[PDB]
C-alpha cells in the first residue's frame, strides 16, 4: 500500500501541501477570495529531487524506444539532481550511468555522482561543452545510450504523466502552476497537461536570472527571479512553512508570491501550486541559508 | 489524495522499499526461502528525518497534557533531527522552539536549527546541555521542555505510526532494525511489533562504544534514556562508525538510497541479522529504518574515501 519492491515505484505522488502562512491569504474572507499556495515536494523523490520523474521516463522510454537494452551505458551531460536521478534511476534498472561533465565540476557534485554509482568523463568553455561534449561521445560511440535531458520529450512527458495528472487530482481547483524552468519539462509537461485540464490556469515560469523541449505556447508568464531573492524565499519558505527547498524552489517562491500578490490584489482567487524541485540539503555547503543575503554564490 | 493543508499531515506514511540487490536474498529459491531487507524511507517526512515523528507527537501529546498553550515555548536540548523537526514541527503548531546546545556544537548544525526557527541558548562544557533545558524549563511555566528521551509520545509515536505502518507494509515482517539513539523508534515500533507479531525480532544497532555514529548512542557510553526498555530488543548488533559509512556508501551505490550515517549502522545490522538467516535457511523480511538522508552528512565528508575516522 506504501510498499515498494523498488525505489523507483516511489516516485511521484509526491505530496502537494498548503503554505497556510506563506499564502497571501489562506482562508477566503471579508476581506475577499484566498489566495493559497501549494507546494508539491517534489524532493519526497528517491533522489530527492523532481528529475526522479524525468529520468525514469527517459530510461522507460529509451527501453521503450528500444534504444536500451540490458547491462548498456547511459551517457547523460549533467553533473547535478538530473545525474543523481539517472544514477539512481539506471542502476535500479540495471543500466550503467556515465555523466559528462567540466573538469571544472565541484569536488562534491561529482563526489555525489560517484557515490550514486554514476561514472564520470570531464567536459573542458561551460556546461554546452559538455553537453557538446556528450553530443559526441554519444556519437563516437553506438553502445552509450544518450537520454539527453534537454531534448528528450520523454522529460516533459513525465510531466505531462505524472506531476500534471497529479497536480490536477489534487488541486483540481489550480489557477497557476509556478515551477523553474531549467530543463523546461516540468513546465512543458505539467504545463501542457494543465492547460488540457483546466481552463484559464496560468502556467508560470519562474527563471533564475532556448531549451530543445521548450514550447512558446505553453507559458503564460515568466518571472525573472533574482538570485538574491530565491535564496531569501528559500529562506522564508523553511523559516515559515517548515519546508526546507533548494535554490530554485526561492525562485519559484518568489515567483508564486508575485503571482500571489497580483491575485490578492484584484481579489480574485488563487490556487498557486508551486514546485519544490528540491530539498535544501544539497545546497547547505553553499552557505546560501546561512548569513548575508550577499551571495557570490 | 496526498493534498495537505499542512506539512505536518505529510509525516509519516513512509515509503517501504525492499532492497532487491542488497538483500541476501530477494527471490525465494526452491533451495533457500528470501531473506528481504525492507528500508522504511523515514526521509520522506517533512524535514527529512524519523524525528518527525516523535517531534509532533510529542507536542500534540503536551497540547494534549495541556502542558502546552499558544505561542508558548518549546525547550528542547538538542542540536539534530530532533531539533530540526521540532522547529519545523513547533512553528507550524505555533509554538516557538528554543534548542538548547553546547556552545561547542557546529556552526553547521546550529546554523540549521537557525533557518527552521529554533532559538538557540548554549549550554557549556551533551549532558549538560540536558540541565540547562529543564533547569531552564523549571523557571518559565510557559516554557516546555519535551525531553525526547524521556517523553513517552516519543515512544508512542512509533508505537502509533512506524510500527503499524511497518506491519501494514510487511505483514510478514521478521526483523525490525533501527538505531538507537533517544530509544523511540525501537521502544515504539518495538513494542508495536512485539505485540501483533510473534517471534519477530527487534534489533537495535547501536554505534560500538567510542565509535560516534550520527543521531545513534551505545547505551553503555552516556545515560541509557529513559525510554528505554531493554525487554523490547531482541538483539542489540554493535556497530563500527566504519561499517556504518561503507554500509551508507553501499546502499546509495547498490541502492540508490542515500541515507544519513545511522542508517548504514542499520544496514549493517539488517544485514548482519540478514546474513544468519540466509545461513540459517530461514525466511526473513528485515524492515530496517532509513532514519534520515545523506544529504545533511554529506559536509562530513563520510561520502569520499571510506579512511576517514
Ligand atoms: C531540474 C530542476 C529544475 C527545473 O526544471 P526543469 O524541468 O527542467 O524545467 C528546477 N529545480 C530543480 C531542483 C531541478 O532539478
Ligand atoms: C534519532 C535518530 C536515530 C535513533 O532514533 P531513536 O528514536 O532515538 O531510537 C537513528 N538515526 C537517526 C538519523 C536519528 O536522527
Request: proline residues 5%.
Amino acid at each position: 500500500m506504501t510498499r515498494y519492491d523498488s525505489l523507483l515505484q516511489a516516485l511521484g505522488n509526491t505530496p502537494l501541501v498548503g503554505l497556510q502562512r506563506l499564502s497571501p491569504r489562506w482562508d477566503d474572507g471579508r476581506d475577499g477570495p484566498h489566495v493559497r499556495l501549494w507546494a508539491k515536494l517534489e524532493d519526497r523523490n528517491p533522489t530527492g529531487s523532481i528529475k526522479d520523474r524525468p529520468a525514469v521516463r527517459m530510461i522507460e522510454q529509451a527501453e521503450a524506444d528500444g534504444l536500451l537494452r540490458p547491462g548498456a551505458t547511459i551517457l547523460e551531460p549533467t553533473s547535478g539532481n538530473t545525474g543523481i536521478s539517472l544514477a539512481m534511476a539506471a542502476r535500479l534498472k540495471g543500466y550503467r550511468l556515465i555523466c559528462v561533465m567540466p573538469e571544472n565540476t565541484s569536488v562534491e557534485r561529482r563526489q555525489l555522482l560517484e557515490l550514486y554509482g554514476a561514472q564520470i568523463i570531464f567536459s573542458a568553455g561551460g556546461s554546452n561543452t559538455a553537453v557538446a561534449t556528450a553530443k559526441e561521445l554519444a556519437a563516437t560511440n553506438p553502445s552509450w545510450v544518450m537520454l539527453y535531458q534537454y531534448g528528450n520529450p520523454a522529460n516533459t512527458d513525465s510531466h505531462y504523466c505524472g506531476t500534471g495528472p497529479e497536480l490536477l487530482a489534487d488541486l483540481p481547483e489550480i489557477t497557476h502552476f509556478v515551477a523553474g524552468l531549467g530543463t523546461t519539462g516540468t513546465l512543458m509537461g505539467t504545463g501542457r497537461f494543465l492547460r488540457e485540464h483546466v481552463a484559464n490556469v496560468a502556467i508560470v515560469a519562474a527563471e533564475p536570472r532556448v531549451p530543445e523541449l521548450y514550447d512558446p505556447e505553453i507559458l503564460t508568464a515568466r518571472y525573472s527571479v533574482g538570485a538574491v531573492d530565491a535564496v531569501r524565499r528559500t529562506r522564508e519558505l523553511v523559516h515559515t512553512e517548515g519546508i526546507f527547498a533548494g535554490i530554485s524552489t526561492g525562485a519559484v517562491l518568489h515567483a508564486a508570491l508575485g503571482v500571489g500578490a497580483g491575485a490578492l490584489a484584484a481579489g480574485e482567487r488563487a490556487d498557486i501550486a508551486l514546485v519544490v524541485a528540491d530539498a535544501g540539503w544539497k545546497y547547505l555547503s553553499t552557505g546560501a541559508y546561512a548569513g548575508s543575503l550577499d551571495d557570490a554564490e
